[PDB]
């Protein structure tokens, strides 16, 4: 079997960072060159794996995380980073074993008048642990006090991204796919 990587990287719709989705890959054969040499990606950084030697390996499972972030936020999708994105939306471990691919999608997720459908969490009591997801959506309060706007000192936790087809590249939409390679005792089922 040939792994459903086209189903992931060419998926029609992508979720917001705070609501990042994960798909697990398994019992298949994965040709990584199909993405390793594409001029398609503006970002293709691997950790403790080396993009090239990819194919020449085996793994029990491969997990793929998908989401959309601002251009200037792609940098936060790496181990040891901090910021609204890394701390409250999606974080990578420190001993990360995988690759992070990103590509500009202005003509797809951007709009002339502006697309604000993609959001990110900017308020949260404590940050996330590697690979932790939070889709709570509960009116935030500095003192963890349950409130309801227009109440004072009560703000919604999610803020909107403003994606236009006319802003700088850094304010443009980027689709990201985080490949996480799992090495468990059970023999491999996903090799080249």
């Amino acid at each position, epitope marked *: 079997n040939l792994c459903p990587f086209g189903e992931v990287f060419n998926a029609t719709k992508f979720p917001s960072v705070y609501a990042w989705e994960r798909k697990k890959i398994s019992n298949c054969v994965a040709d990584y060159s199909v993405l390793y040499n594409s*001029t398609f990606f503006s970002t293709f950084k691997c950790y403790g794996v080396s993009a090239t030697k990819l194919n020449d390996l085996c793994f029990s499972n491969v997990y793929a995380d998908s989401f959309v972030v601002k251009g200037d936020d792609v940098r936060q999708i790496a181990p040891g980073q901090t910021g609204v994105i890394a701390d409250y939306n999606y974080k990578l471990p420190d001993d990360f074993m995988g690759c992070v691919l990103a590509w500009n999608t202005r003509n797809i997720d951007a709009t002339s008048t502006g697309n604000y459908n993609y959001k990110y969490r900017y308020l949260r009591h404590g940050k996330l642990r590697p690979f932790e997801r939070d889709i709570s959506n509960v009116p935030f309060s500095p003192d963890g006090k349950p409130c309801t706007p227009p109440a004072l000192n009560c703000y919604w936790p999610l803020n909107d991204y403003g994606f236009y087809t006319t802003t*700088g590249i850094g304010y443009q939409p980027y689709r990201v796919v985080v490949l996480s390679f799992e090495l468990l005792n059970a023999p491999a089922t996903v090799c080249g």
Partner: antibody
Amino acid sequence: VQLQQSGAEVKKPGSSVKVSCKASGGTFSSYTISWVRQAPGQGLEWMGGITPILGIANYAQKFQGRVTITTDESTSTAYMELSSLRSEDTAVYYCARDTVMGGMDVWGQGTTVTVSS
Amino acid sequence: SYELTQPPSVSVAPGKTARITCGGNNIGSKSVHWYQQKPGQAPVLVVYDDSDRPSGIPERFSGSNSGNTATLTISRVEAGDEADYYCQVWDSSSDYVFGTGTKVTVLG
């Protein structure tokens, strides 16, 4: 389109300066303005930028902490304020419209800023 | 920190073509921009997105990008083409990066 910048300035080390950039149209619409500086006989260097319509700015690693890019309420004028001035900061400051592909399109005439005692 | 590399100089006799190279890690995956800046003037975009000319720039200016080398080509150089030429790109980690710049001199 065209960009109009504020006049030349002179500042004592340690103080701060704030340059303005006004679109010849009256508004920046839905595009992004960038700030680039060039010290005498030196090269070009990106300092940061802002997308007026979004009200969100961005800065370069090097000037993180010393620079503040903003817009006026009407959103028709962008400002660049640099703090803790030093002689090494003596240079020509330009504002420029960001291309859609990661470059600069329209450049302002530039604002000469001299830092000295 | 992403870096770009340009030769400091380039000499060419009139009417001949001058070539300026910009080096960078897999710069072909990036959208290269070239700026022309004459003595005491402001920069001018001569080539954007690798090889497109903004309206108003002579067809003599053309660029190319592939691998780890982007190139600015100026056919039939004129004395008026003397200036500093800068290449530039945007990187997700370093924002907008400019090359050290290349000074073009016309001989004879």
